[PDB]
Amino acid sequence: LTQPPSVSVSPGQTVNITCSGDTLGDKYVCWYQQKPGQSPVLVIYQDTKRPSGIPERFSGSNSGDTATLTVSGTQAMDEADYYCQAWDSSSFVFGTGTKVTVLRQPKANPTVTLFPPSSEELQANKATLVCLISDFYPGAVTVAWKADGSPVKAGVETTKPSKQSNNKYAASSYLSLTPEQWKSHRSYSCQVTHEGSTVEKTVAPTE
């Protein structure tokens, strides 16, 4: 029971997730939608049927060796992994899942918020600079840190971007210093480049 690993679509445009296996038409197919960090949700059962609550935008078919989940006016919130599941009188088999992406979403610049070490963390003899990056699209940024204008090439941890609930992306970056290192420079800069343009935020030990 196989599915394409990924499929992409424009917003409002219809996408098809296929599931294929021998004599699949002789089996009852279910479809599950699983958004990131969430449980799977039954979206189609008995090839064609929607559970109460599932909108008409979702529909299913199953003929021959291929079953198809169709979603018509695809919105960004429809992005998920879709799994098919085929039933016999004796067994079931899960599909390997298909990730759906919506592509032509409007461009969005990142919001950057940068926090200095709390006095509490300093008294615990550590110093973390926290750079939080929000509301950008597409979901790719580059993060560079500077200390007094020179590149910081170590002690940085940056997450991969992940989807927010409003369908834009977020990421975060951490610069971990000793209190000594923190106080030994005049300025620190977190710089976030997105689509060729850059947003920089500064903190300084002298507040």
Binding site: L42, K49, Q85, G95, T159, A170
Partner: protein, 222 residues
């Protein structure tokens, strides 16, 4: 009908994963298979097994040697034990209610539990240190300001964060964790609030780390 699995945590190599799923809004003695499925990070759904209220079991053949699942009518729940674990057993485990195969409608899984992340590791459980991220003019945008909490150095995942015990929800943004080379995680949660009432409103983040049975409520002051 709702399913609630027991909380996330760590299991040592060769140890036994042990989970329960409490069933509400319905009875266990209903005509359904009560099942367990797992999902290793970045992977697909893998069925583990199922019991009926009678006690009959069906297990994934590949796991049957290590798996035991049972029911408890008096507590309206069923449970899973998976022994001799390895790093391959690290996964989000789901409980699910499974319809009996019907000749007209087939079968289906509904509903699912919320999922619980079980991490197989030799390292010790470690609760988070929480630090406030104070609002200031440098975190201000006209009528709104950002403030937050830094949740440092915990293991394993996950951490959950709410604000003012859940009374503050709009403007909340909790970021995914980084993994440090130390083997420990950190994350941050930020909330955007009116900038005009920083001297008036109390903001507290409620940081939940279930693997260590720890919750920290940290006041964040301007």
């Amino acid at each position: 009908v709702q399913l609630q699995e027991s909380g996330p945590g760590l299991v040592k190599p060769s140890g036994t994963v042990s989970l329960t799923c409490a069933v509400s809004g319905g009875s266990i003695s209903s005509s359904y298979w009560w099942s367990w499925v797992r999902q290793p990070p970045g992977k697909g759904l893998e069925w583990i097994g199922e019991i009926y209220h009678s006690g009959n079991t069906n297990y994934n053949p590949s796991l049957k040697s290590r798996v035991t699942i049972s029911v408890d009518k008096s507590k309206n729940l069923f449970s899973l034990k998976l022994s001799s674990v390895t790093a391959a057993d690290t996964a989000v485990y789901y409980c699910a209610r499974v319809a009996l195969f019907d000749i007209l409608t087939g079968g289906w899984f509904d509903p699912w539990g919320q999922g619980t992340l079980v991490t197989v590791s030799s390292a010790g459980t470690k609760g988070p240190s929480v630090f406030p991220l104070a609002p200031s003019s440098k975190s201000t945008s006209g009528g709104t300001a950002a403030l937050g909490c830094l949740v440092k150095d915990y293991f394993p995942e996950p951490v959950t964060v709410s604000w003012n015990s859940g009374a503050l929800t709009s403007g909340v943004h909790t970021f995914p964790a980084v993994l440090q080379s130390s083997g420990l995680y950190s994350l941050s949660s930020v909330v955007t609030v009116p900038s005009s009432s920083l001297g008036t409103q109390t903001y507290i983040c409620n940081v939940n780390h279930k693997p260590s049975n720890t919750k920290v409520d940290k006041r964040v002051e301007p």
